[PDB]
């Protein structure tokens, strides 16, 4: 069974736990390239009453650094906000809880904005069919495949 965070049948507790960044995408590709601030490797999501504690690691010169961030629920169901290199809001348009999680984020910094989409897996990689489903969701948001970066060959420290 699949659900969206914005949907009536969403069960937020079910996204608690281990996750790995499999693919990232953006309509501002530099944000997720090598030294981009949004090239984040998710490790776990801790579900709380009104927030999600996101644990990531970033990479610089082949060196991993831990980074934790707290996302608060906003006034719209299924939407979360978090301060990180600007003001961010995100939703989970599709997840099956047991294999994948697809997030759609809007960042706003210095009066600008960009979209980020992420595909996270319970294991360090996902099937090619789920990766294709993610590409389809990115296309629905006007993000070209050339702006989608598979990081499955580089998500471990
Ligand atoms: C700040 O939020 C993020 N940044 C980069 C990748 N993924 C995320 C969360 C949406 C999980
Ligand atoms: Na809104
Ligand atoms: Na959407
Ligand atoms: Na959205």
- DSSP string spanning 35-99? T-TT--EEEEEEE-SSEEEEEEEEEETTEEEEEEEEEEE-SSTT-EEEESSSEEEEEEEEE-SSS
| Any ligand 1 atom below 6 A from CB of 95 | no
Does 42 sit in the ligand 1 pocket, CB within 6 Å?
yes
Residue 117 beta carbon below 6 angstroms from any ligand 1 atom: no
Q: Which atom belonging to ligand 1 lies closest to the Cα atom of 84?
A: 1
Ligand 4 center to residue 101 CA distance, Å? Answer: 14
- What is the residue with the minimal CA distance to atom 4 of ligand 1? 38
Task: List the one residue out of 79, 82, 86, 90 whose CA is nearest residue 37.
Answer: 86
Q: 1-157 falls under which CATH superfamily?
A: Calycin beta-barrel core domain (2.40.128.20)
Ligand 1 lined by 71 (C-beta under 6 Å): no
Domain ranges, ordered by start, for the chain: 1-157
Ligand 1 pocket test: which of 33, 56, 95, 120 has the largest number of ligand atoms within 8 Å of its C-beta?
56
Contacts of 63 (CB under 8 A, 6+ apart): none
Please give the Cα distance from 70 to 88 (Å, whole number).
11
Q: Is the CB of 45 under 6 A from ligand 1?
A: no
What is the C-alpha to C-alpha distance for residues 71 and 54, in angstroms, rounded to an integer?
7
Instruction: Write down the experimental method used for this entry.
Output: X-ray
Hey, whose CA ends up nearest to atom 6 of ligand 1? 40
Token output for 42: 């998710």
Main-chain phi, psi angles of 132, to 5 degrees:
-70, -40
Where do we find the tokens 């990479």? 59
């Amino acid at each position: 069974e699949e659900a969206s965070s914005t949907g009536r049948n969403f069960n937020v507790e079910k996204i608690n736990g281990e996750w790995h960044t499999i693919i990232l995408a953006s309509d501002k590709r530099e944000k997720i390239e090598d030294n981009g601030n949004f090239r984040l490797f998710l490790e776990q999501i801790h579900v709380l009453e009104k927030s999600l504690v996101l644990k990531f690691h970033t990479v610089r010169d082949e060196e991993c650094s831990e980074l934790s961030m707290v996302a608060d629920k906003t006034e719209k169901a299924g939407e979360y906000s978090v301060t990180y290199d600007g003001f961010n809001t995100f939703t989970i348009p599709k997840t099956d809880y047991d294999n994948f999680l697809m997030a759609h984020l809007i960042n706003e910094k210095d009066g600008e904005t960009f979209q980020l989409m992420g595909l996270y897996g319970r294991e360090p990689d996902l099937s090619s069919d789920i990766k294709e489903r993610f590409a389809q969701l990115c296309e629905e948001h006007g993000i070209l495949r050339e702006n989608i970066i598979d990081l499955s060959n580089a998500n471990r420290c």
